Amino acid sequence: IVGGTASVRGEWPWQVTLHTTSPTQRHLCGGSIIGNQWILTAAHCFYGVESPKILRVYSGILNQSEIKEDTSFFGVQEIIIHDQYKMAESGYDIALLKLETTVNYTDSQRPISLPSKGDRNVIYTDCWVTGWGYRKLRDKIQNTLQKAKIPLVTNEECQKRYRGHKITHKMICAGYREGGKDACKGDSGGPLSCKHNEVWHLVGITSWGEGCAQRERPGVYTNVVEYVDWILEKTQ
Ligand SMILES: Nc1ccc(-c2cnn([C@H](CC3CC3)c3ccc(-c4c(-n5cnnn5)ccc(Cl)c4F)c[n+]3[O-])c2)c(F)n1
Incomplete structure (x- = not known):
């Protein structure tokens, strides 16, 4: 974000950070909680992604530095990319992540x-x-x-x-x-x-x-x- 300011814990509880773990772990994209098992994000995010196996969804995160080897994350069961997606600039830039299990909603993780x-x-x-x-x-x-x-x-x-x-x-x-x-x-x-x-x-x-x-x-x-x-x- 250009020209923005820092958020505080709990301020945007539907915001997630989607990490890839290949070849190393890093933030890949943002996403939004829309259901206990469902993240909405951009199809462009998966351009280099060999399969859902390497994804981690982190919710309730303020600082990227909070994420350590024991921080809990949700696995991704399925990536559902819109069938007409070709490239971000030509539209259809939308994807659902079906999580392996249901987020129990809390103050820090909300739809x-x-x-x-x-x-x-x-x-x-x-x-x-x-x-x-x-x-x-x-x-x-x-x-x-x-x-x-x-x-x-x-x-x-x-x-x-x-x-x-x-x-x-x-x-x-x-x-x-x-x-x-x-x-x-x-x-x-x-x-x-x-x-x-x-x-x-x-x-x-x-x-x-x-x-x-x-x-x-x-x-x-x-x-x-x-x-x-x-x-x-x-x-x-
Ligand atoms: N270290 C590291 C380095 C790079 C990246 C990285 C690079 N590009 N991207 C994405 C596309 C990639 C995920 C498929 C991307 C593309 C475009 C925009 C964007 C812009 N921009 C125009 N010019 N730049 N931005 C403007 C307005 C709006 Cl509305 C926008 F959306 C935002 N993003 O994120 C992530 C990273 F994730 N980590």
């Missing part, structure tokens, strides 16, 4: 609701992107989970900034005209979380952008509301 039936025309004005990613284009994974408030932009404006890509209704963009706050490397797969009537909704999945936090280049997110039928089909 975020999907965008609700009948909210298709809500204007979300309280949206935040979170993650352990770079604070700038050439940087490092951050120890403490970072947060930044970022405004949504219309798909019409977004398309005008990305005339070499097809910005569709299955994408949602977010950023400041002047730049300065955005996701960056290591944030993808995590949530774009928007609060409406004091309830958090998983509005976007952090996906791609041109640089990080550049002027007039909003970040691009998977528009979760357009995949609700797909999520329900896969999780049922």
Whole structure:
């Protein structure tokens, strides 16, 4: 996260850090708890991933340095990638992780609701992107989970900034005209979380952008509301 600030323990309890363990253990992507056995993340995350065997899902993590050889994690039983996914910038950047067992929810590990039936025309004005990613284009994974408030932009404006890509209704963009706050490397797969009537909704999945936090280049997110039928089909 560029231009963000540190979170405190318990602040974003649906946020997970997905680790790979091949050839060595490192943070791979963010993700969001959407069910006791279900993480929603980005399909792009699994580009180099030989199978679910090498994944570890950590929840309830504030600092990456909390994770040690005895820190508990959830195994991944299945990676469900959208059948039309080809590359992040062309959409369908969405994946479900089915965990081997059910998260018992606690103060530090909680679900975020999907965008609700009948909210298709809500204007979300309280949206935040979170993650352990770079604070700038050439940087490092951050120890403490970072947060930044970022405004949504219309798909019409977004398309005008990305005339070499097809910005569709299955994408949602977010950023400041002047730049300065955005996701960056290591944030993808995590949530774009928007609060409406004091309830958090998983509005976007952090996906791609041109640089990080550049002027007039909003970040691009998977528009979760357009995949609700797909999520329900896969999780049922
Ligand atoms: N050590 C270390 C080093 C690198 C990485 C690493 C590298 N890229 N990525 C991902 C894609 C990889 C996981 C498949 C990625 C891609 C794009 C974005 C992104 C951007 N950016 C534009 N230019 N950069 N970012 C802007 C806006 C939005 Cl909205 C974005 F989503 C975020 N991420 O995370 C993870 C790492 F994870 N660890």
